[PDB]
Symmetry: D2
Subunit: 267 residues, 4 copies
Amino acid sequence: TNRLQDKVAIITGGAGGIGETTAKLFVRYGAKVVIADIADDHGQKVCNNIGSPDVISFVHCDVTKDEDVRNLVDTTIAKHGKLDIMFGNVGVLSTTPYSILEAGNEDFKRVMDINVYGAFLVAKHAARVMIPAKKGSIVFTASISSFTAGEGVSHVYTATKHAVLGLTTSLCTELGEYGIRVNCVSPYIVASPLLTDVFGVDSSRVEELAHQAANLKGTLLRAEDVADAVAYLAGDESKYVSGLNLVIDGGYTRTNPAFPTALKHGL
Amino acid sequence: TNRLQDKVAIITGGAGGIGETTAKLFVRYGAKVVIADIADDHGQKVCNNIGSPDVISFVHCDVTKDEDVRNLVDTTIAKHGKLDIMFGNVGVLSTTPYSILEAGNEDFKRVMDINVYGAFLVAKHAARVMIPAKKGSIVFTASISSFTAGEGVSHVYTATKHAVLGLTTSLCTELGEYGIRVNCVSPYIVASPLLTDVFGVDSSRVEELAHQAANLKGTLLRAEDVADAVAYLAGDESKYVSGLNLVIDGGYTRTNPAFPTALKHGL
Amino acid sequence: TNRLQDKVAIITGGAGGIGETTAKLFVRYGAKVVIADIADDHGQKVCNNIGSPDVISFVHCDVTKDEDVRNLVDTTIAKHGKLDIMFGNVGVLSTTPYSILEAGNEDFKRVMDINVYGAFLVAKHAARVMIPAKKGSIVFTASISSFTAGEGVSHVYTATKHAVLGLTTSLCTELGEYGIRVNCVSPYIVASPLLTDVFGVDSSRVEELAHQAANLKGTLLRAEDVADAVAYLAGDESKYVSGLNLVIDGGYTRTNPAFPTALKHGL
Amino acid sequence: TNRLQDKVAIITGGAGGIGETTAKLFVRYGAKVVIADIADDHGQKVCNNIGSPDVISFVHCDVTKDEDVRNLVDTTIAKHGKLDIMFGNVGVLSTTPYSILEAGNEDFKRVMDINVYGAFLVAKHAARVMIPAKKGSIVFTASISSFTAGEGVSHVYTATKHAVLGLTTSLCTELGEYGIRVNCVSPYIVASPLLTDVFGVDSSRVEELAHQAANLKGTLLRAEDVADAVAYLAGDESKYVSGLNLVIDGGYTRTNPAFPTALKHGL
């Protein structure tokens, strides 16, 4: 609760769950945080009543617009004098069918632009103010889709999460010279909002589907667990951690259980 | 012998080093091949070397244009009746500096569009034509930059080669259901690079430093070595390999020699 | 054709499925081969099928005995003058239960000694003989257990197949200096398994469930598919690949289908 | 400093640097710790004066002896009633030459026995008392040698660190069912003791060699940074993290700088 005492953090995304929860945690740990997103949050009680107005502020920002990200960073340096942490948490899903036969061309271009170019911009403007200080920790939200595939997970989304892992690795290698660390976090399904499926598109129901399919029983992956991983990478107790893909999946991707199972019941 | 007898192959980037030599090898193995590239008179110049018009042909194709890739695939089916192999061989380098501070937004979007959206289109149109036949092998050219970073290797090139591996992985998982294989090849420095454009350094000079920095001594990585790996993945000798990133780097990426070198060799 | 003409190969585990079929393929490609296994009358029974005594021979060899592996290698050099290829194909399964609570200390030591120390010895004696000639290709049989876990796959088998990949990686890094390549192959379930020994389930039954659980449909993984990958790594068509874990699993390990399956297919 | 309040932890190794430092941190965070090793520490002021006798105790234990590890765990359950954390920190180096031509057979067997079988035993007895509670976090010390090779890093040591990663993955997949998490930490060179090289075998000098060769400048990797990573994985702020190889190398393994450098000065 002083783990991040007087550190200045920018969190993009913010009106989504992981961004909101990580902002709450960072404030609890003593940081000053600037929340950014285009949606201009849910209402007010997300960014402004995560913490009090002296520790948290909101900025409208479309991460695919260089002028918006430039303004986000420069506003923050104007307000707080420095930037210690950049948490790039913008990731969108495909709007078109899974199946290469139906997957959309414009949709491929839209998700690449948001998920990869937006991450590039956030990192570029974070590096612009961190490189002169020779201090910084940049964290990207990736996914287990940064190294695995999945039925129903679109080809664009797993190509863009592999690309965010690529930017983490590439930026880690350039920015280590200035003492800046670059890492990413790769979650399994995080509890809520709800998320669609024309079946039981209900958060409690997909949480029990996620637990049923999980390696690591007796717990559910939540936004607070992802926020904990981001606070570890963001602060000074990970000062020699860089280029790490911190997978938070309870071991889900350590196995494909298909053949043990199609041996057990599946006969 | 004639390992690829009767097979029909499309090779994009056919005017380049890997494209031309892989086309030469596939014709030697008894395949019918359709070369495609945007360098139209330049690429049919290349086709007019390899073989006669009944086994090899050239069509102009900009891989970021859905209409050109549709054309390319529909013409191959019209000419030859089937598509057994799609070798997605288009990748471009960044044309702005390595540093994230000088890297450049429009260059980032262009290399992303060619390297990843262009690869998605080629694979999409190959799948459209291959899934009815329940047979096919799709090979992408990736790079050791699909899983490592490098000083002087742009952040967008590393992001897009990670994304190509992402596409290989997610397409392998969808298309296995139809008996179609999807793999990629990840080379180290292939033979040449010719950098007279910048300050000095020619082909044989880069060849010498690449061997000096190589793990595997006594040989150079050639376009013919990459063609051989593509031929393996493309034919019948790899009938159960899919989702493989076939690294052809002589073991270069298996170590970072910097600390061994720092505890000296001999001054 | 005769891809391996004049090459001399040693194949350990030659009485097993992969060993015998790889020996058959290497003879077809024009190689001289020396099969080795502890099943002495049983393995020369196998050699007496493949070819005539001038191109194939059998020597008894316990790979955990330095004196036997020295014998094997020195006999091949005495007979044929050189060693071009060493195919390290010995791996055993645990003979105690999967659960860490029932797993068994002496079984852990035995599988470790055969699977890893046995692989080190084979590679050590191959290097002794290959490094003077500055030529050679060493291939180890690993498993998809060299990078994933599985329910019912013992902890010692997974540890030793990870260790075989470790040996491939560190040997590749030492031996590249002498122009020698070191790679491994990592298969999914090869054709059979025959479990009448435990409660039920035969060969064609395991074959059916392996295909049912497979990513790549319409074909089964065969010993001939693994032999083909070994032949690729063993010959001249892979002259710049070293340190490669050549996964032959039809894309099985590229996804964990449990959560896609949990958000149902159709009940 | 209450992050681990009333958690019971066993740390093996202990008289080495990482074990001592992690024990100090765990006590600072409110845990009760049992230190184990054969050497019976440096004197007394390591295990007994890390913390006070009410929070820390020492137990002689050779991890290759099942009776010793059985006694370590059962002593701990007798003293504190439960086991929350097992930190397996025993790893020995090769005693014989790097170079497959000179690397020792008995030395290969000794390091495998300590590094892999010892880890198996520690995990086996930790699982025996954790599985009934359906609670637990097991952390192994691995190395960047669990996935990379290095000139001068022995083949046994990188085969055993790959095997500890294999045990982490395999145990993670079995023990997730009981709610137990299994992870490992993979460091670059950690500052001290001193460590030999017939050159400047001095800690300050190898620390500046390590920094010279590092990605991530301006800091040195220390035992306190490794201890921080272990405390993250050990406590409840990583409750959905399992099967993770937490690399702590400042990005060192994200690149092989040989060819950029043999381009820069090396001409």
